[PDB]
Each structure stands twice: as C-alpha cells, then as structure tokens.
Design a protein around this ligand. Structure first.
Ligand SMILES: CC(C)C[C@H](NC(=O)[C@@H](N)CCCC[NH3+])C(=O)O
Ligand SMILES: CC(C)C[C@H](NC(=O)[C@@H](N)CCCC[NH3+])C(=O)O
Lengths: 486, 486
C-alpha cells in the first residue's frame, strides 16, 4: 500500500469526468429538439456525431500536449479547466434568465417555426469534446504511473478498478442525472454534471500534492526520423511502428462493439419493459439511459469477481499471461454475444407478426413484442465478460507497449483508432441500409425495427468479429515473438 | 524420398478399407429392410448402432493385440483376414443361389409376414466390426512409422495424404458402390466392397517386403503399476495419465461433430436437390450417400491446398506449431459452421410454411423447401476447414503423445473415446426429443423435420462446441507446459 490516496483521487476524477461526459451524451439529441433550439433530427444527431468525432480526433493531440509541452498533470488540470468552462453553456442555455444573455432571447416554444444560439452551443460542444479528449488520453497513463514501480500485475489491478469507477460513474449519470433531465427540472439536470466537473477539478488539485509526476520531454517527437544517431531514440520508433498493425486490426473490433452497443439498445427498445410502480408512469416516463446502463450495471457487478477470483486463478495456473490473449478471448465473447443476439432477434421477429404491444419510453410509442426484456441477460453477460477481458487488456497493452517517453500520445492514438472504428461501423450501418440490402432500412436510429432485419445484421457482425479475431490471433503471435525472444 | 512405396501401399490399403467400411454402412439399413430380412426400422437401426459400437469398443483391444502379442503388421494382416471372411456374408445373402445355403431359404418377398438368417448377418457384422476396429487402430501408427525418422513434419505431411486417401476411398464408395446398391443389381453391389477388401489384403501382403516393422513388446502392459522400480517404464505411465484429460475434453467435440454429420445430411434431405438428366430420374433414384459425400468431396478438394500452401506459410511464419492449437482452431470452425447451419435452418423453416416441394431420394417423398441445396456450401466449407485442422492434428497428436512402446493401444483408446462421444451425442439427441423440449421430436432420423426445430439444435451444438473449445484451450496450456518446459 502506501499510495492508496494517489489512486483514489485519480479514480474519483475519472468517475466524475465519465459521469459528466455520459450526462452530456445521454439527452443531447432530446435537448436540441426543444424550446431553445427546436432543431431537426438530422442536425441534432450530427451535433452529437461531431462532438464524438472531435473527442476522438482531439485525443492524440492531447497526448502530444501532455508529453511535449506540459507535464501530463498540468495538462490534465488545463483540460479540466477548459472542460468546466464549456460545461456551463448547457445550464446557462436551459435557464430562462440566462438564455437571453447567451444569444437573443429564444422565442420559439412549440417549435412552430436555421439554428438558434448556434455559436454558443457549438463552442460549448467543441470545448467539452476537446476537454474529454485531452483528459481520457492523459488520465489512464498518469493514473497507472502511481503503481508502475510494482510490476505489471499492479497496473492490471489498478486498471480493473479504473474501469470499475468509469462504469459506476456511467451508472450514476445515466441512472440519476438522465432521469432528472427527462422528467423533472432541466436546469438542475444540466447543472449537476457541471458540479461534477468542478468537484473533479478540485479533487485533482488537492490530489496533486501526492501524485508522482514526470517532467516533460520536448525533444522526443522532433526525433521521429523517417530517412534511413543518438541511442534510445531509435528504440522509441521501433517500439512505435510495431504497435500500429495491432491497432489497425483492433479497428474492426471497435466497429463491431460500437454497432453492437447501438443496436442492443435499439432492440431493447422493442421488448416488453416492466413498469416501475410510480417512477415511469404518469406523468413521468422511463429514460432510455437506463436501457443503456443495462450493461454497465452488469460490468460493475462482474469486475469485483474477476479481480478477486479469476485473476488469482489465472495467475497461479499460468493462463492468459499477456494482454493480447485476453483481447482475443474478449473478441471471442463478443462474437458469441453477437450470435446470441441474432438468435434472440430471430425469435423476436416472429412474435411481432402475431401481436405487438405499445410502450412509451422517450415520450414516443414503441411497438414491442410479447417477450420479457430479461431475455437479453445472456447477450449482455457475454459482452460483460468480453469488456472485462478485452477493454482492460487493451488499455494495459496500450500503456505497457508504449515507450516511456511517449505514453499519452500512444493512448490518444489508441482512442483515435477506436473512434475510427466507430466511424467505420457507422459507415457499415449506412452500407447495409441501401435499397439493395433490406437489412435495417426502415428509418434512422430510435425508430421501428419490426420491418427491419436485425438478426441478419447481428449475424454479419458475428462473422466480421470472428474474421477479425482470427486476424488478431495471427498478428498477435507475430508481435509476442519480439517481446521476450527478439 | 526412398520410402515412397512403403507409404503408397499403406495409403492404398487404408483407401480400400475405408471404401469397404463406408460401403457396408451406406445402405445397411435399407438392405435389412428387404427380401431376405424384412426387418423393422428399429432393429435395422440397432444393427448399425451395434456394428459401430463394436467397431469403437474393439479398437483399443486391437491395439493391445498389435502391441503385446503381434507385431502390428501380422496383426493388420490377421484383422484383414477376419475382415474379408466376414465380408462374404452380405453377397452370399444377397445371392439367391447361396441365400438357401446361409439359412433356410428366405421366402418373404413382399414382407407380408422375428429375424431371418439372424446368426449369419450378426456374425458377419461382428467380424466386420472387429476387423475395422483392429485395422483403424493399427494402420495409422504403422503407416506413420514409415516416415517417423524424418521429424514431426514428415508425419504431419503423411497424415495429410492419409486423410486424403481415407476421403477418396469414401467418395469412391458412397458415389459408385452405393449407387450400384441402390438402383442396379445388388449382389455385385455388395460384392464390390469384398473385392476391395481382398485387394487391400493382397496389397498389404505385397507391401510387407518394404515395410519397416517393430518387434512386439509383451512385457509392457504388465508393468502398469498403480500402487505407489525399473526405468523407462515409469515414464510410460506418466506420459499416459497426462493424455487422458485431453481425450476426455475431446469427447464432447466428437459428440458435436457426429451430431452435426447426422443433422447436416438430415437437413440436406429437406432442400431442393437438382435432378441429374438420366441418372436419378425414372426408373432410378438419387442415393443419399451422395448427400453424405457432399463433405468428403470438399475435403478432398481442400487437403492439397493445405499441404502445399497453408502448411509452408504457417511453418515459415511460426504459426500453429503444435497439434493442440490446430485442434482448437478446428473446434472454432466447427462452432462457426454450427452457427451458420442454424442461420440456414432458421431461413429454411420460414419457407416451408408457405410452399413445399416434393422430392424422392430414398424411394421416399421429402417435403423440401424452395431453397437450393448449394446454400449449404459455406456450412460445409467450414467443417472442411475444421477437419483438415482438427482431425489430422488429433491423429498426429495421438501418434506423437503416445509412448514408443504403446502406440496402437493409445490410437485405439483415441478412437474409443471418439465412439464414446458419438454415443453421448446420440443420448443428447434423444434428450432434446422429450415432451418437455420440442426440438427434433417429430420422429426418428430420415423423416420429416418441418415440424421440428433444427435451428435451435444447431445453436445448442454451437454453444456446446464453444464451451468445450474454451475448456480444451484451458487444458491445452496445462499440457504444453510439460512438453518442453518440465
Ligand atoms: C473502450 C471505451 C472507448 C469504451 C468504454 N465504455 C464503457 O466503459 C461502458 N461500460 C459504459 C456504458 C455506458 C454506455 N453503454 C468507456 O467508457 O470508455
Ligand atoms: C475422426 C474420424 C472418426 C472420422 C473420419 N471421417 C472422415 O474421414 C469423413 N471425411 C468421411 C465422410 C463420409 C461420411 N460423411 C474417418 O473417416 O475416420
């Protein structure tokens, strides 16, 4: 022990940061379709798409800022400051007293009659995305540096609870904050994540007195020679060009898991959801963020079992000693869950032809089938086993396979390739929606999937995941042969 | 080279042996339901079940005979002699001139009116099964001993063409011999496999002059001490008790692949099969052995591609150096094929509700769907990739992981555990047919599956295969750690 405070402070900072981030993405589309904006669905979705795109693209640049110029701690503080500065825009816009201060004074109430307060919300989204980008690429290596002098097992044990805190903040946001934004006063609904950001900044500032920081290395990126003589700078390029194919093969894995995360909630919208006695009935409604947290809850339950039972057994039996093998196991569980979801959708698509029941979730009617929502339990347990096997392993791999000088930059490139996979998954979803292929071609997301073929999409995702699993297993052997052999 | 004749003779012997064996099992049920016997379907199926059971149970005993008493070459010759002696019973029974010599003189022609010539056919089946049992357990180690002094790569290359010859004899039997037994004169239909057995015996006798044999070791099994001091006899037990869990975990793999081999042909019976111009039309009919060889043809096509392209690349890239990893890859392909077959059956079960077409294969009407048989091409290509990855690897593993003194016995135990898996698969098929579970509960095999749920059975087989794949991958690491480390 001894360094328990330096880890707890980073865990709390990441928890609050993820809570605020999943608060801004849980009801942003519904907020843009409201009194102050009255935007259309296309632009409302494009706003969140550009937000996540800036978050993914900005992430590497945040690592370069934390490595070449700043010390990866002042970088986190500055990024959290820019994050908090952009967080006030949403409560200031939702408040009628300050909506006049932001831009004009929004008159449109029933959306009877092209964007209002566009620069304000766009600057807020840009600053929030850049803040999340610079934080996520610098919070995992700086957090793992607190226990780096104890061995890789300490970093893995820390990353376990790091992921656990990320999906306890996500549950606290999607469960509590989103329900507040959906049914009760909205100004406080957006003010709570801002308070979370402020508390995270304060916690990091107080924890700076016990953190073990590293001085910046400015003359590290200028020595990326590409024409072929100081030493220890050649190895930083040899250890960098060898980890690129791993991320390239992980891109389609991100594609499959992001499309699965979207389509799983989309399918959960079309199942029989039980009514909470007096929480989702009149005059309130059930938020969709709970259907989204249906998999963070399982992860939160699962992680303590892996850290206490699975990891010691696998360590004392010599099973899965490297992170790449755990990533392969996670991808196998991902394709298994995709096949299970395809089976469940094939069974569900036969029930909607006979009888459909109407349910209201997002103040909209969904024609669900006569099938309990708890039938998604196996398909969610499988992705729960996969993320605790693939995501934590990928994080500790990006932390360990990176050079000592370039860590935040490599983590930012990891998140950027994850975002590239997400965009490839969006393009794949748009590809199967053409007139040639009738799979998922009724309308855009959050609609009616009774006329679509989601089981075929799940089977295609499973086949793709299996192919990229074989590819990753092929390239994993070619990479582990240079870790302790060459 | 230099030893090309000693390998070609064993390949031809195995080819003819497998051809005769797959000739006796292609139309045995239809033969027992005919003029000389007029048996019922239950006893006709029980006869083949007991035949295969004696084949599987007898296999280890054949290895003990080839190791403790005989020299594994005289054992093969004696087993082939007993095989040929039991092969004459079927042509002698089918011939009207000798049917009176066998037992009485069978009068029942239209089966108007409890077994006729029961001792004759039972003794023939018993002797043929014991012959196949003693041959299969002694033909692979004796055949692999011709190239054992060149390295494991030579044994793997030999086993490739060994499997290729096994499924070229199977095609020559199911394609040519079964079509002769189905439409044209039946006496010659059963006399052809007997000629094949005689030719195999003659070929082995002529090739005995170039085979490299091993003297028998009688004092090898008496030293299986189980209470706990000559050396090299303790290692023979340590290398024997360690390979038992591998076979125990391979048992459910055999269960899944035997049930798949049965249900794949059963599903192929319910698809649109094109008519050969003047081969399957009046007055002839399409044999089911061709629908069964639909996967041996693909294997025959695939094997030369693996021996010439896949193996050199995997060798020069350090990929899959052990047989257990290839077995795991084969099991992964098996579960992938099971999922694909489940998808295809889910698509097929929706077409039979609208329109069904009638087709005659075994002189019986099948209500097939309006779906081409060539849609089974992916599900058969996957099992083709699996067998060339799992079966050859399992054979070379049973040959290499066995002690030098006990090889045929270990191969016989391998085939016995395969048969145990087959019987477990039969019990599993009988388990899902209870009144509680409506999966495959219309009737016995070779019937109507339009009222059954074969897609659910395929999904269950896929889940079981994945579970046993994870188990095998877990136990594979615990076994490879004592090959070159301990
Ligand atoms: C791999 C990264 C990009 C994703 C990771 N996701 C989670 O932690 C989820 N378990 C949270 C669930 C909320 C929506 N389904 C992350 O948070 O960074
Ligand atoms: C693993 C052993 C027991 C099976 C093996 N099977 C084959 O070779 C098939 N490819 C033959 C196909 C004919 C019926 N589908 C064997 O022959 O021993």
């Amino acid at each position: 022990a001894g360094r328990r405070a330096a880890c707890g402070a980073v865990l709390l900072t990441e928890l609050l940061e993820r809570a605020a981030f999943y608060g801004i993405t849980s009801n942003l589309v519904l907020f843009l379709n409201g009194a102050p904006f009255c935007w259309e669905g296309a632009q409302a979705s494009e706003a969140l798409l550009l937000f996540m795109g800036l978050t993914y693209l900005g992430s590497p640049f945040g690592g370069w800022l934390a490595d070449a110029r700043l010390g990866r701690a002042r970088a986190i503080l500055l990024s959290l400051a820019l994050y908090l500065l952009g967080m006030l825009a949403f409560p200031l816009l939702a408040a009628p007293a300050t909506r006049a201060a932001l831009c004009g004074s929004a008159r449109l109430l029933n959306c009877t009659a092209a964007r209002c307060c566009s620069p304000a919300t766009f600057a807020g989204l840009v600053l929030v995305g850049l803040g999340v980008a610079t934080v996520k690429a610098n919070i995992t290596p700086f957090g793992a540096d607190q226990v780096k002098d104890r061995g890789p097992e300490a970093t893995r044990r820390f990353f376990n609870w790091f992921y656990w805190s990320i999906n306890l903040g996500a549950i606290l946001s999607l469960g509590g904050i989103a329900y507040i934004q959906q049914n009760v006063s909205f100004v406080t609904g957006y003010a709570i994540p801002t308070v979370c950001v402020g508390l995270a900044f304060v916690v990091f500032l107080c924890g700076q007195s016990v953190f073990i920081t590293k001085p910046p290395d400015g003359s590290a990126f200028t020595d990326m020679f590409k024409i072929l003589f100081t030493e220890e700078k050649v190895e930083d390029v040899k250890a960098l060009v060898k980890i690129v194919p791993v991320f390239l093969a992980l891109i389609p894995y991100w594609t499959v898991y992001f499309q699965m995360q979207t389509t799983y909630v989309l399918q959960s919208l079309h199942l029989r959801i039980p009514e909470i006695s007096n929480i989702t009935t009149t005059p309130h409604t059930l938020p969709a963020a709970w259907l989204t947290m249906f998999d963070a809850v399982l992860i939160l339950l699962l992680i303590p079992l892996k850290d206490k039972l699975v990891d010691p057994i696998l360590r004392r039996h010599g099973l899965l000693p490297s992170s790449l093998k755990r990533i392969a196991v996670g991808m196998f569980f991902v394709m298994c869950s995709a096949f299970a979801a395809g089976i469940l959708e094939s069974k569900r698509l036969n029930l909607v032809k006979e009888k459909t029941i109407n349910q209201t979730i997002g103040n909209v009617v969904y024609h669900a089938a006569d099938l309990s929502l708890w039938w998604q339990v196996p398909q969610y347990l499988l992705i729960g086993i996969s993320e605790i096997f693939a995501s934590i392993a990928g994080l500790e791999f990006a932390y360990s396979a990176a050079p000592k000088s370039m860590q935040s930059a490599i983590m930012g490139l990891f998140f950027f390739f994850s975002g590239v996979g997400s965009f490839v998954g969006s393009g794949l979803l748009a590809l199967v929606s053409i007139k040639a292929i009738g799979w998922m071609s009724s309308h855009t997301d959050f609609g009616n999937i009774n006329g679509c073929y989601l089981n075929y999409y799940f089977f295609l995702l499973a086949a793709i995941q299996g192919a990229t699993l074989l590819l990753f297993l092929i390239i994993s052997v070619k990479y582990d042969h240079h870790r302790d052999h060459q």
